[PDB]
Amino acid sequence: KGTKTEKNLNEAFAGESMARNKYTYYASKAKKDGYVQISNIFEQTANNEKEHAKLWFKLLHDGMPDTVTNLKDAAAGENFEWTDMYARMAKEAREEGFDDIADTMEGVLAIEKTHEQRYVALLNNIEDGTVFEKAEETLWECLNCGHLHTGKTAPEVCPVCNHPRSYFEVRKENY
Amino acid sequence: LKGTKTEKNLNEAFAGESMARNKYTYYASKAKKDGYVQISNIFEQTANNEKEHAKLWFKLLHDGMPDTVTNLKDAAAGENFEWTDMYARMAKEAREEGFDDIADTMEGVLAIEKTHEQRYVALLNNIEDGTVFEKAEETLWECLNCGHLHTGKTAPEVCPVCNHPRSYFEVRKENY
Amino acid sequence: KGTKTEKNLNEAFAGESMARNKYTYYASKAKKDGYVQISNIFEQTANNEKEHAKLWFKLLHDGMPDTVTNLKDAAAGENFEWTDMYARMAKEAREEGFDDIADTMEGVLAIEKTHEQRYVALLNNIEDGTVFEKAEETLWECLNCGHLHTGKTAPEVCPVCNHPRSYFEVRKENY
Amino acid sequence: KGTKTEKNLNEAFAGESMARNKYTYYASKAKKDGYVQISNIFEQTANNEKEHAKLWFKLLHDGMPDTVTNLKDAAAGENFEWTDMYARMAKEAREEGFDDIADTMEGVLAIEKTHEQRYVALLNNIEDGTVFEKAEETLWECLNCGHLHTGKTAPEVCPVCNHPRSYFEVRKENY
Ligand SMILES: [Fe+3]
Ligand SMILES: [Fe+3]
Ligand SMILES: [Fe+3]
Ligand SMILES: [Fe+3]
Ligand SMILES: [Fe+3]
Ligand SMILES: [Fe+3]
Ligand SMILES: [Fe+3]
Ligand SMILES: [Fe+3]
Ligand SMILES: [Fe+3]
Ligand SMILES: [Fe+3]
Ligand SMILES: [Fe+3]
Ligand SMILES: [Fe+3]
Ligand SMILES: [O]
Ligand SMILES: [O]
Ligand SMILES: [O]
Secondary structure: OOOOOHHHHHHHHHHHHEEEEEEEHHHHHHHOOOOHHHHHHHHHHHHHHHHHHHHHHHHHHHOOHHHHHHHHHHHHHHHHHHHHHHHHHHHHHHHHOOHHHHHHHHHHHHHHHHHHHHHHHHHHHHHHHOEEEEEEEEEEEOOOOEEEEEEEOOOOOOOOOOOOHHHHHEOOOOO | OOOOOOHHHHHHHHHHHHHHHHHHHHHHEEEHHHOOOOHHHHHHHHHHHHHHHHHHHHHHHOOOOOHHHHHHHHHHHHHHHHHHHHHHHHHHHHHOOOOHHHHHHHHHHHHHHHHHHHHHHHHHHHHHHOOEEEEEEEEEEEEEOOEEEEEEEEOOOOOOOOOOOOEEEEEOOOOO | OOOOHHHHHHHHHHHHHHHHHHHHHHHHHHHHHHHHHHHHHHHHHHHHHHHHHHHHHHHHOOOOOOOHHHHHHHHHHHHHHHHHHHHHHHHHHHHHOHHHHHHHHHHHHHHHHHHHHHHHHHHHHHHHHOOOOOEEEEEEEOOOOOOOOOOOEOOOEEEEOOHHHHHEEEOOOOO | OOOHEEEEEEEHHHHHHHHHHHHHHHHHHHHHHHOOHHHHHHHHHHHHHHHHHHHHHHHOOOOOOOHHHHHHHHHHHHHHHHHHHHHHHHHHHOOOOHHHHHHHOOOOOOHOOOOOHHHHHHHHHHOOOOOOOEEEEEEOOOEOOOOOEEEOOOOOOOOOOOOEEHEEEEEEOOO
């Protein structure tokens, strides 16, 4: 929009998200310190700030975009994390003596790249129509009840809990 | 540490990562409504990952995790800056440009942050005065774990029902 | 009304509910024992048993009754708890020298008594029509964004987050 | 053992477990019906019932057993579900003409089978010492921060967020 409110909403979206994080950590510390009600108040306040940022976020994007656009924005944001920000952050820390901090910025840098690879893989499934369909028969699992359906395609409706198509994912047994 | 560009950078990555946590929460929400439960769970999974990344930079800027007595003080000052300065400037900045409803929302949020500080200073007052688990007045206490009710000036040392300590006791009110 | 399936359905709801409680304690014990993945497996299994019990519950109740019917049912089973079951269970524990746990059963008995009073008070609020209306000017709180409103009635729509009247409650400030 | 209190606590574990599931369903319906606070109060009461049933559970089981016993007890429970419990109701519902809900009991029966052999797979990982240590080069994921580590054994402490091995699991990428 090129308007001062546009930059204000960006500054308002930040900080409001920083307040959410700060109050989530304070809730965990207050519980360890022996204050359960204070912990709940920190977390109810953390949820209040979560909803304030949603107002500014929905104004900067004219509502809430669809999952295809959301995956495209997240993949571009995570790519910026490990190619620009966390990279440049590590060099400036090493030029000042913060070796240890620089090594931490790079372990987090390696994680954001795995976030983009995951995000691009999910976006490719929507564009290729392979979200609920495989080129070879697989094992599907229902996130609602756990019903297993072997098939080249996912069921339209789960035959147990009657939940729709969205609740089916490729079952993994990583143990 | 302080005065360096690393602080600028250490403070910056705290943002963005905190900003990424909310997007992925909104993105996870929009995913269920679009018909993608796994993509919803993956978005939320990534959000909590970014939640812990920001904790690393937050503890570096605060020399670890401060105690609760300081946490309530910093939270009170953080919300004080919100309603006396931050959201007050954008209220008039948005009104002098035509967005009357955007400033009205910012003014409504400004009043909410004011109640956030008043709530925080009252909780910090209860710790510094020693009135978090004891009143000079006979009050009705409730155990947040099991629901045991206890009448008296002091909260029970241990809940006699579920054997939970004094922390799970708050001052009970019924608001309906 | 008198089929073995009705008992089977009634009995299946009990067993699935016990397993949901069993796996929530197992998840906490595993997370303390040093197994986050095993703790996570215990958690989603309990959610599966929660959905299995939901299938049998909706059959015995012919769908899902509304909140007014659910409140009358919640207050009924709660009255049966502290006037019949836990009272009979306590006197039988004392007849076997189990005085330590008979005091616990009576401690839980008093809690279920308070839960009945909470449930009747809410149902009375729906009947008389004082959920979002009060005879005095009260202070309303938006459970989504935190907006505070003064007056006899809650706002039809929150003027901050634009959420309906359903998110409003009397502010307690219990500290 | 052999006393009426054994049967009473075991009847108290049920019902208390059934009330938590009932109040969980009532909370979801209350939010749809337009009563967020009532939905919160239903949810708050459901957590109270969970801790009441926890008291009766730890009395019957003499405290909280180890994860080894918890996996053995849980696997022995799901086997009962599909070899005896649901196997009986499935044929009892068909003799009375309830074919619509007999297919659901058979579908749930197959799920409890997968629950059993998934529990024994975790148990075998503890008995063989193969929870965090594999004879093959595996890819591990930190369930707290998302750090990836390829290795035969999980990293004693995560080198990014400094969390213990508990938060480490085998990564399977089911998409
Ligand atoms: Fe805010
Ligand atoms: Fe990121
Ligand atoms: Fe299902
Ligand atoms: Fe990150
Ligand atoms: Fe704030
Ligand atoms: Fe208690
Ligand atoms: Fe089940
Ligand atoms: Fe009860
Ligand atoms: Fe609101
Ligand atoms: Fe109870
Ligand atoms: Fe089961
Ligand atoms: Fe980690
Ligand atoms: O905030
Ligand atoms: O179950
Ligand atoms: O109960």
